[PDB]
Each structure stands twice: as structure tokens, then as C-alpha cells.
Amino acid sequence: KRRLDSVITHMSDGIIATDRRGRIRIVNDMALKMLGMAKEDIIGYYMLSVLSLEDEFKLEEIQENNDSFLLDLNEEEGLIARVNFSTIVQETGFVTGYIAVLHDVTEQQV
């Protein structure tokens, strides 16, 4: 996690944070609305499976500096999110978790 670019975040963003093993342990309400899912169907499940990426992408491929993935989060309700993955790291460099920031393509700024 050398640059902060992939943790640039806005208040309308969906946030997912996982444990050491990539299982969702934090998910904010916006992420649940983007995903059309319930917190109970999310907590403890694998982030990459919930994001429908488990067969094209694995945790090992989340690098120190990642770019973004454009995802169709809800085809049933026309939502494109640019998705920024990143590792969480303690004081000596070791991965303790993972982050997904879900940016609505149509999100606004000032």
C-alpha cells in the first residue's frame, strides 16, 4: 500500500473490509444498497465471492498498488462501480486484511 490513491474515498462510497482471509467483517450501508444485499448475507462471506469475482481474481493478485475494476454491481438496477482493492498492513508490512472501495461511476464531488 505505497500510495493512498486506492484508499481515496468519498462519503457516498461503498466500503468493504475483510479479515486476514478475505472474509467480510465490515460493510457499510451504501455497499449493501449497491449490492442489493443484506448485512446478514455479507458478514463472514468471502469478499471476492460476494463481488462475483471469485473465478477471475484472487486475493494474491491484490498488489501493493492496484488500479481499478469497472463492475456491473446491479444489472437489475443499472449501476456501474469502479472498484478499488487494497491490502491492509500493520507496522512491518504484513497483510492483515483487505479493502474494497466501491465508487459509483455517477458519484458527485465539489
Residue that has been written with the C-alpha cell 474494497 in this structure: 100
**Interaction of residue 9 with its own copies, rule CB under 8 A:** yes
**Interaction of residue 81 with its own copies, rule CB under 8 A:** no
Residues 104, 92: Cα–Cα separation, whole Å: 33
CA distances from 29 to 18, 26, 32, 106, 110 (A): 16, 10, 5, 18, 23
Q: Which stretch binds Zn ion (CB under 5 A): 40-48, 59-67, 73-81, 99-107?
A: 99-107
**Interaction of residue 25 with its own copies, rule CB under 8 A:** yes
Which is it for strands 79-89 and 95-104: parallel, antiparallel or unpaired? antiparallel
Amino acid present at 93: G
Q: Residue 95 corresponds to which cell in the numbers above? A: 497483510
Q: Which x/- pattern over 40-79 shows residues binding its own copies (rule: CB under 8 A)? A: ------------xx-xxx--------xxxxxxx--x--x-
Q: Which residues define the annotated binding site for Zn(2+)?
A: 10, 13, 103, 107
Query: Which residues of this chain interact with its own copies, rule CB under 8 A?
Result: 3-12, 15, 17, 25-26, 28-29, 52-53, 55-57, 66-72, 75, 78, 80, 82, 86, 88, 90-91, 93, 96-97, 99, 103, 105-109
